[PDB]
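Fill-in record for Chitinase-3-like protein 2.
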Amino acid sequence: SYKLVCYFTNWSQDRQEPGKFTPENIDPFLCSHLIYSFASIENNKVIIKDKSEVMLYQTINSLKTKNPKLKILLSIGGYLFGSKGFHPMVDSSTSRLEFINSIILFLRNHNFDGLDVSWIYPDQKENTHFTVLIHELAEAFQKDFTKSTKERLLLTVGVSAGRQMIDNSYQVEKLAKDLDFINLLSFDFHGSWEKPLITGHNSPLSKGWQDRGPSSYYNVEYAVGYWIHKGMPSEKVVMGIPTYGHSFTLASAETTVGAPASGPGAAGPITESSGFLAYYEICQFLKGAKITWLQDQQVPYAVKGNQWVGYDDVKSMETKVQFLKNLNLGGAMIWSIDMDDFTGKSCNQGPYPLVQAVKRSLGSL
Ligand SMILES: CC(=O)N[C@@H]1[C@@H](O)[C@H](O[C@@H]2O[C@H](CO)[C@@H](O[C@@H]3O[C@H](CO)[C@@H](O[C@@H]4O[C@H](CO)[C@@H](O[C@@H]5O[C@H](CO)[C@@H](O[C@@H]6O[C@H](CO)[C@@H](O)[C@H](O)[C@H]6NC(C)=O)[C@H](O)[C@H]5NC(C)=O)[C@H](O)[C@H]4NC(C)=O)[C@H](O)[C@H]3NC(C)=O)[C@H](O)[C@H]2NC(C)=O)[C@@H](CO)O[C@H]1O
């Protein structure tokens, strides 16, 4: 009994094949939870800015018709929403209450089962506001369920896997009460924003051999453990796994971890964004590359020419799943199913090779 919580996005629809994803591409039995990314906030109220908003509602109802066990949530936030997106809604209880009531009506009208708040990030400044908003939602949700024939709206949150960010942003014990679970964002541990600019893996399970001091923090094992230590019960920890990798353009001839990089990797042809590659792009890149499995860190990286791609593959799916079960975690979260090879047409491994491996690994006694 593990959750498989699957984020998907509303921007992947503008991609060319085979990055071209709509909710209609979703398998109703693939995951236990679906989270739509992202909603917006206009007039201290919840909306959806998506030209496919209405067809999405239609797909939601089809999905839940085919799988009555399926739970679909709505997410607010993300890296680009930032902290700014939550202003001015959080600035007072009045505007906050206006919001919380928009949410309840919204989710009921549209057949969502809860809400994800993935605020990136509260940090020091907004620690208080984030805490308060979560508590007011949690309470309003409970209150609403008091007067209901419906199951109660679930509340989750996408949270930092970064030690310092966790220290600055969260009151964990409070969070443990208010949230049904965290979606631990246990990736983006390394990437081309770093200084000094050196190759590093986006989502390492374990410590690197060269990791010392606060680099010892930048792995999944650590992140997960620190959350539990800070108060979050293990079963409320839902462990994020990525379907993308972080890329680097190599400065010199070192191809190792910690090798100097001139900048982010060449942009994928489909995701057109230098620094990362979806898995369906990674599979093309792997043709003619040399791949190394890191023993220390338990994940692969691939080199082809001056390109260095740290990524996650079927082998790390199964490896990460064993770890999360060993630690009695609540399950697995995926960012994002629409960057797996969902069509099956690039990796020739069937549809959703990575997520499918995760399902199987959780499902296996
Ligand atoms: C002060 C200082 O110097 N501090 C240093 C500091 O940098 C180090 O800490 C590290 O910082 C980095 C960067 O700030 C952190 O990286 C961020 O990590 C979070 C996770 O914690 C990421 O956000 C979530 O995760 C995914 C994957 O990255 C996010 O996905 C992105 O979402 C956006 C939308 O919001 C996507 O944009 C869309 O895509 C295209 C263009 O790319 C466009 O066409 C679309 O229209 C656009 N959509 C929208 C809505 O605008 C983007 O594609 C996508 N990326 C991918 C791969 O899918 C998602 O937003 C987040 N999910 C949820 C849920 O919230 C965040 O993306 C990521 N930022 C960057 C830049 O990659 C890092 O976590 C942090 N590390 C640690 C360990 O804490 C510290 C280290 O301590 O050192 C200091 O020195």
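KEY FINDING: The longest helix spans residues 127-146.
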